[model samples]
Structures are given as C-alpha cells and as structure tokens.
Target: LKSDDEVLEAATVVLKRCGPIEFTLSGVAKEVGLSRAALIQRFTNRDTLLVRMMERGVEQVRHYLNAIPIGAGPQGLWEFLQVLVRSMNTFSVNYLISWYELQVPELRTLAIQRNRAVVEGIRKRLPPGAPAAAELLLHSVIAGATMQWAVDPDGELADHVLAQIAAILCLMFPEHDDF
Candidate 1:
C-alpha cells in the first residue's frame, strides 16, 4: 500500500518461490501487508503482476549477459564456455518460468527483443562464421536444463541434463578436456 514498488517487491518474492501458482495473489498480498482488494487495485490483476515481474527478470538476465566478457583467440572461446558453466550454477526454475510468460501479447515484443539481444550476444561470442544454428543450440541447451532444473530441483535427471550442457560446450574446444 505504501507504493507500487513495495507491492511488486513482495510479489516478486512469491513468484520466485512458486511460479504463477493459484495462491500467488493472496500470498503476495499477505506478505506486503495489503488486503487482496488493495493489491488488485494496484496491479489490476494477477497476470499484470506476473508480466511486470517477468519484465524485471528479463532486465536481470540482460544485465548478466552483458556482464560476461567476450574474449579473443583460442583460449578465449574455452574461457567463455567456462563462464557459461559457472553462470548456470545460480540459475533457478524462476528463470525458465519467467521465459514461459514471455508469450503474453502485451509482453511479446519487448520480451522477444530482449531474448533476441541475449542470443545475439552469444552469437557474437561464437567462433567466427560459426554455424547459423549454433547460437540457437546454445540457447536451447541453456533453456532446456534450466527448465528441467526449475521443475524438478532435486531430481538427479536435472543434474545430469545441466552437466551435459557444460560437456557439450566443451566439445567446441578440441584442445581442452576440462571446463
């Protein structure tokens, strides 16, 4: 009730705790000390809150991608893959679930733009004249494991999928067996 920002901050915590569940609205309302009516008045509806939370998450991903250093030469690409592996350690199901929400009509354009930017950033970092699908493959690998981990955090299957991602990237560098 103090400000929209306060409500959204509270809403973000709940969304991350449980992605787009049935009780999110009431849960966020209780956490922010707002009645359901007051929260709805500020956010209009749950979908709007979801979209805004996703937008904020997109900004975070954008920031993370930009922070990754793109280097040059042989060890460069190998080093980059190491960065990718390290980055995944912090990923949660929230990242994958937020990507799923990017399809909402209102968010499609902006979300796609942000999504494209991330792909392009990866593309530019790839070996010169790499296959057109390489970037897409890399993106898919990231998304695939992230989605799996998000849905089943404790499963051995999720752990294996993510480990394969790092192994696949290691293939790009024939010189090194580790990373």
Candidate 2:
C-alpha cells in the first residue's frame, strides 16, 4: 500500500547502500516491501527507475539548498556546507551512474544540475568582496575532502571537511580570524 514516492524513497537508500552495479529491482522491492514484478510494473525497467531516482535526487538537493538562509556570510557558509558534508556518503552512486555510464544523458544532465545547485547555494552564502571563484573552490574542497576521507578517515567526515574548509578560508581571506 506504499505510495510510489515512498517506494522510490526507500529505493534510494537501497541504491546508496548497494551502489549502481549491485542495485536491482528485486533488491528495491525487498527493501520497499513490494514484489519485483510490482516495481517493474511501476518503473518499466531498471534504467527508467534510476533516471527517476536521479531526478528525485536533484530535486532533493535543490530543496536542501533552498532551505538554508542566504547572505549570512562566513559563519553561514560554514553551517550550510556542514549540512552538505554530513549528507555526503563515502561512496557516491550518483558519481558512478553519471560518470561511469556516459550513455545515460538524462543522468549526466541531472548530475550537472545537482552540482550547479550546490555551487550556487555556496555562492549565496559568500561574504561581500569574496572572490568569484570562492563558490567553485569551496565545492572542490568539499569533493576533495570526501575522497580523502574515504581513503584515510582518520576522524569524523564532518570534522575533516570543516578543518579543510577552515584552512582554505584562512588562506582565502586572511583577515577573517574568527573562523
């Protein structure tokens, strides 16, 4: 009796856990308490289901970015990025789907849209007089930190990302001693 939205939501968790290579409609069905045939009836095929999932993921990113207040300066940027870092996983299905499967144009576009949404979200919180590359640099730093954490993971992901961010901020704006 679960709605399709509810089913897809559960499917996302399954996909994140299993990754695209291991993901299957049967797995999603089991996770969502539905039959594999039921999932096929609703989604038509695995590719279609993944496309829909990516679309939903893009919308979810936008929703998260929009929920944060803007123009709050350095502290605001840190808080906004902390939310994003906390949400990031050690392994990213989106990266695999979009990067590994170049044949899927829909997924590629959705991934681009999602990345742009995040960069713009970072841009909105940047303080006045911040460099034009600030948002992109911050995004790169976060991505880099995620990869680094996956390899080392010396401490919490949030702590690692925040420390990287703090170091970058020190160099980017040396006058800001409060961070």
Candidate 3:
C-alpha cells in the first residue's frame, strides 16, 4: 500500500471479510497487494494492527460526539438515537469485532474509556433530570445489537432491531416533540 493508513484500511476490509481467525498480517497484506515483510515493517504484528483498528473506532466516536447536533428535548434525543442506529447499520465488521474483542486488557480499557466519552456526550445533551441508567442501558443495547449484526450481517434483522431501538428511545424520552 501507499501509506500506513492505507494498510490499516486494507486490514479493515480484510478483517471484515475474513473473520478474526483468518485476519492475519499475511491476509491483510495479500488484500492490499503488499508483501508480509512490508506490512510487518509498519504494523509489527496482528495485535498492533488490531489496536490501531480499535483506535480508529475511538476516533469515530470522537467524531460523532463533536459532529452530531444534539439539543435539549425529545426530538433532539430521537435525532441522536437515529444517528446511532444508522451508524451501527453502516459500521464495518472489523470495527464491530474489535469493539467486542475487548478481552485484551489494554484494548478493553481503551475502548471503554473512548465509548464512555460518547455516552457522556449523550448524557450532557439530555434534558435536565434524565436518568443516567437509561442512557447507559440504551448504549449497552445499541452496542450489543451492533456486535450481533457484525457476526451475522442480517440487514432485515438489523432494520427491525433499529426500529425497536427507535421505539425504546421514544418511550425513554417522552417530553418533547416527536422524533
């Protein structure tokens, strides 16, 4: 590939298509039309590559936190939830797998901290006195559903789940304009 980010992008495509067990440096290299030695010179090993991918996920969270225009009402909350659903629907399987494979202690810590930043952003945008537990539970459900979709790639199932999530969000924040 032309650059390290390009290599990582290739790795992303490879990991999503190949599953965890087959997502080796060699596989990524082959996907990118590079040699193993070339990829190793940049990534060192599989864990390093995985860590980099996880870091990208964190960056994505940061982007959404800054970019989504949330306000203080049910309509805003509904808008935010819709953004999250569409995000899950479109995420690469590589990112979803990395999110779930947080058994690696460092990876777990990194992902948790980053994800919490996003959750905290949601909390800050909530109308005064909204329960913290609801936001946490809502985030948990979205994450679990996204991970399940990664393992299966079920479009129809995911759409139905997204609809359910929308329904829950509506019930969860019932004080503002309909979303």
Q: What is the lDDT of residue 106 in candidate 1?
A: 62
Candidates 1 and 3 compared: the better one by TM-score is 3
* Model 2 per-residue lDDT tens digits across residues 74-148: 667777777788877545555676564466777777878988999988888888777877999999999888778
Off by over 4 Å in 1: 1-3, 88-103, 107-114, 145-163, 175-179
Measured with C-alpha atoms, the lDDT of residue 120 in candidate 3 is 80
Q: What is the C-alpha RMSD of each candidate to the true structure, in Å?
A: 4.1, 2.4, 3.4
- Backbone clash pairs in model 1 (N, Cα, C under 3 Å; residues 3+ apart or in different chains), count: 1
Worst 10 residues of 1 by lDDT: 73-82
TM-score of each: 0.69, 0.85, 0.78
TM-score for candidate 3:
0.78
Residues 1-179, candidate 3: write the lDDT tens digits: 67778888888888877766557999898888889998888888887888888788788788877898877576676677767666654456556566556756767877787878878876766766566666787677777777676668756545745666676766776664454
Clashing pairs in 2: none
